[PDB]
Amino acid sequence: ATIRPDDKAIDAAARHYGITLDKTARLEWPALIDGALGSYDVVDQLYADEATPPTTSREHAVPSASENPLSAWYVTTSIPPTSDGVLTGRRVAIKDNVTVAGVPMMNGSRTVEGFTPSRDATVVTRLLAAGATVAGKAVCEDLCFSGSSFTPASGPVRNPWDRQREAGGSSGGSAALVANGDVDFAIGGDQGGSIRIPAAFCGVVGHKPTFGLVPYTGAFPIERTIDHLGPITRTVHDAALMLSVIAGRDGNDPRQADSVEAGDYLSTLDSDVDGLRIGIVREGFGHAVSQPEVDDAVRAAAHSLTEIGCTVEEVNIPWHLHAFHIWNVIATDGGAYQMLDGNGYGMNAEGLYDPELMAHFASRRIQHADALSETVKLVALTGHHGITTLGGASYGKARNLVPLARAAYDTALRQFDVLVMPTLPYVASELPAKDVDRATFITKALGMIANTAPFDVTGHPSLSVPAGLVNGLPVGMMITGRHFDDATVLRVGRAFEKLRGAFPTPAE
Predict the structure, then answer these.
(1) What residue ranges in 66-143 does DSSP mark as E strands?
(2) Distance between CA 117 and CA 185 in Å, rounded?
(3) Is 271 tagged catalytic?
(4) Where along the sequence do coiled-coil regions lie (predicted)?
């Protein structure tokens, strides 16, 4: 039977709503609430009998310091494919915010550590059905709220290009393992650039697919309207291949529209791009906080596409800057409302939920709140202010502005086939010392998402490909296109890699 609240809990609930309880009320509510919970008891029983996922027994191991040099692995496994396929003979690391049944996960946080899911994320099932072996869980930022790699409760993920530098973040571990050659590819999550940022920092390919193309089912939700799952690989071809396996509706994710269909990302991947119009987004360069060498390198790279028949022109998109602020409001008010108060999944959306995860996270969140990264706390504090004192109105205003941000990009996309700009304004910087200043922490954790985040809110497919090296470190060029035109984005990316030539491995 469902647990009932005690008298102080009832009183506390009343205070929360500004409801004052009379001595007579304090006496009647208990039985009334108990009666109301009769329905919860039934749901509890129905759930136990009709919707409790079957047990799963898989092996996992915590790597020793030796076998985990970059601190990129949370736990290692060897889950065999259920069928042979286009991924046969390949290993894949799974970002720790994505569930793999029978294998522990902590989403880089003390508030989730200790949890072992009962269901496999849809992407995991598809990967295994395509012949891939799941090699393990890759470390990610504390509750995925960091653009760097120093917020994981398990320690900072190190860039294989320079172990004293950041691997980028939340998917830092995934990118690191891929760049370091530990796995063929990885699944990453992207809310504000979490797939693209680490790919850029580590010099690998990272693709944030069109919003809703890849099912988020089974991944730890942050803000429903900006959650994306996508591939992190060493080459564009591998990204297209992985996308051909994970793309598609699964019927359990409310983010996926009825019209969503996987495209054909391989057939014309290597087709000529002669005549394609490429737009260099001016607002994507020369930010106050950035390294001009990076901007020039990427800029040069974008122009070199004329060598293969592309028309390259600069274009102004003022809304690109506004989109960042809109994203911020949505990720902050929405994030606190959903990820924290809603215990990851939140409510009011049809779909597949993970009640076990919600309960686990709920009990540990308050008990280990102080262990939360400073960025998550910033979101909790200002978000709480937006939700309560501000009445959520700022979130409502941001939402009403998204169509305009989306239309701004689509207008440019009518003049060009794809838009390009630097994925990041600078190269992997050194990790902060365990004594970092809270203000430094926040700026160093979220100061590199200016170009990536806007596309998380508008939903356009966005690809990050290694553009070159600056001071011996990777820099990435970001290619963005029309919704569900991931094929063209990948094709342009493939064309660029061919022109650019093989990109060096940190093992060199």
Answers:
(1) 73-79, 91-95, 133-138
(2) 22
(3) no
(4) none
CATH homologous superfamily of 55-508 equals Amidase signature (AS) domain (3.90.1300.10)
Angle between helical axes of 236-246 and 486-500 (0-180°, round to 10)? 160
Phi/psi of residue 48, each to 5°?
-60, -40
Q: How far is CA 155 from the centre of its chain?
A: 19
**What is the rounded CA–CA span in Å between residue 176 and residue 203?**
9
Q: Yes or no: say if 10 and 30 are a contact pair by the CB < 8 Å rule.
A: yes
Instruction: Pick the catalytic residue from 95, 137, 208, 444.
Output: 95
CA proximity to 375, closest of 431, 286, 438, 428 = 438
Q: Write the single-letter amino acid at 18.
A: G
- Segments making up each domain of the chain, as ranges: 1-54, 55-508
Experimentally, the structure was elucidated by X-ray
Asked whether the CA dihedral 206, 212, 213, 218 is positive or negative, the reply is positive
Alpha carbons 485 and 487: distance in angstroms, whole number: 5
* The pair of three-digit structure tokens given for residue 248, joined into one six-digit string: 């598609």
Which CATH architecture best describes the domain 1-54? Orthogonal Bundle (1.10)
- Each as own residue / partner, the long-range contacts of residues 292-299 (CB below 8 Å, 24 or more positions apart, any chain) are 293/470, 293/471, 294/422, 294/424, 294/425, 294/426, 294/427, 294/470, 294/475, 295/422, 295/425, 297/467, 297/468, 297/470, 297/475, 298/420, 298/421, 298/422, 298/467, 298/475, 298/476, 298/477
Domain 1-54 and domain 55-508, same fold? Reply is no
Residue 265 phi, psi (nearest 5): -95, -5
Partners of residue 162 on adjacent β-strands: 159
Cβ atoms of 128 and 135 within 8 Å: the answer is no
* Distance in angstroms (rounded) separating the CA atoms of residues 249 and 214: 7
194, 290, 373, 462: the catalytic one is 194
CA distance linking residue 294 with residue 272, whole number of Å: 28
Q: Which residue has the tokens 């909790």?
A: 380
Tokens of 339: 């990820």
Give yes or no: 304 in active site. no
Note if 363 is an active site residue: no
